[PDB]
Design a protein around this ligand. Structure first.
Ligand code: 091
Ligand code: ZN
Length: 394
């Protein structure tokens, strides 16, 4: 899988992208690797934040589906026109696929200035594809049309006038053993829509938050490479910040820091890492009543940002933030670990990443099993709206 190592790039906090080609002749574009969505969509007209964009008219293999599409998120939205074309990943498997492509004609707060990506590769399942689940996602087409095994794995590696460059690997169709150390532990995919998982316990420096475990998964928990932060439901976020504040309390930061709105700095090389606690998320195991924990360091949840003003200092942003749409294990979580999206066996694997940032006292960890007697169900059941209920699924 050596051709696929180091096939991701980006700027810290602005997303990890893979180079792709679309059309004949091939048009090169940088595409955000997003496990939190299910569309393949590309800028297809001019925009202040785009260096370039997909030109449908210039591809001999383009076919128009004569259907539009709209995709809104909490943060960002876009629209455009559906088609199919030939798609390749130059630093990926040596194959070409005909895939659905949404050509983005208008957007708001979607593209990011300086991020260097021009589209989004949604790697999650058909159930959350827009406009509906009959629009086959890219990965589904790749698997149906070629020999590629139904699995991919991600190694996201964390980091004065520009943000820090980041790198990573998307291994399509298998697992590369150079990218991790130790044991690979799996948590079941609860339902194939998002990459939904179940968190059963949360500890901050070995201390249990002691919430009803449904709170951890209210209203869902997902793994999303296209989200920067670890995002936590309001109640959990408040409890967690209260605990990190207590552990770190020899230092008094502004409110803005804990809201993710302000940097805090120390003299170059003097950051007191050991005043900030590790955070452990216990995930449901493949075996009933078992779990395993993934443990991240402050080196994951404190994001480095060079201050043009005091570029003499090491400065950081707090990258845990509040959610009202459940837990999101974003790049903060993922940068600890080699993460295996084992779609074939409806599971997600975690192992300690060979590239994760740590120090000489602590490492990110993946440890199990931990066993419980008579587990409560920690899953939440989203209220069924009449809209969603009325959908037929043929
Ligand atoms: O919710 C989001 N808003 C946004 C904006 C731009 C790119 C990617 C995204 C996501 C889509 C799913 N993962 C993150
Ligand atoms: Zn019907």
């Amino acid at each position: 899988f050596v051709e696929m190592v180091d096939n991701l790039r980006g700027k810290s906090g602005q997303g990890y992208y893979v180079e792709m080609t679309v059309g004949s002749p091939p048009q090169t574009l940088n595409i955000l690797v997003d496990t939190g969505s299910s569309n393949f969509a590309v800028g297809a007209a001019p925009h202040p934040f785009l260096h370039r964009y997909y030109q449908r008219q210039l591809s001999s293999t383009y076919r128009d589906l004569r259907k539009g599409v709209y995709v809104p998120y909490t943060q960002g939205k876009w629209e455009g026109e559906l088609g199919t074309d030939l798609v390749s990943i130059p630093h990926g498997p040596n194959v070409t696929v005909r895939a659905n492509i949404a050509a983005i004609t208008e957007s708001d707060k979607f593209f990011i200035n300086g991020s260097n990506w021009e589209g989004i590769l949604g790697l999650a399942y058909a159930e959350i594809a827009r406009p509906d689940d009959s629009l086959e996602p890219f990965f589904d087409s790749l698997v149906k049309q070629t020999h590629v095994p139904n699995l991919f794995s991600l190694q996201l590696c964390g980091a004065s006038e520009v943000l820090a460059s980041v790198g990573g690997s998307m291994i399509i169709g298998g697992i590369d053993h150079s990218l991790y150390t130790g044991s690979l532990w799996y948590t079941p995919i609860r339902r194939e829509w998002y990459y939904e998982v179940i968190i059963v316990r949360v500890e901050i420096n070995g201390q249990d938050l002691k919430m009803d475990c449904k709170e951890y998964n209210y209203d869902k928990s997902i793994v999303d490479s296209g989200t920067t932060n670890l995002r936590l439901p309001k109640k959990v976020f408040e409890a967690a910040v209260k605990s990190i504040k207590a552990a770190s309390s020899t230092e008094k930061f502004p409110d803005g820091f804990w809201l993710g709105e302000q940097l805090v700095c120390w003299q170059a090389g003097t950051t007191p890492w050991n005043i900030f606690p590790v955070i452990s998320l216990y995930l449901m195991g493949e075996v009933t009543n078992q779990s395993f924990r993934i443990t991240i360091l402050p080196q994951q949840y404190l994001r480095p940002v060079e201050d043009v003003a005091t570029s003499q200092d090491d400065c950081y942003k707090f990258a845990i933030s509040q959610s009202s749409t459940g837990t999101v294990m974003g790049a903060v979580i993922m940068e600890g670990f080699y993460v295996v999206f084992d779609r074939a066996r409806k599971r997600i694997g975690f192992a300690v990443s060979a590239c994760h940032v740590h120090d000489e006292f602590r490492t990110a960890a993946v440890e199990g099993p931990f066993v419980t007697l008579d587990m409560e169900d920690c899953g939440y059941n989203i209220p069924q709206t009449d809209e969603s209920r009325s959908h037929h699924h043929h």
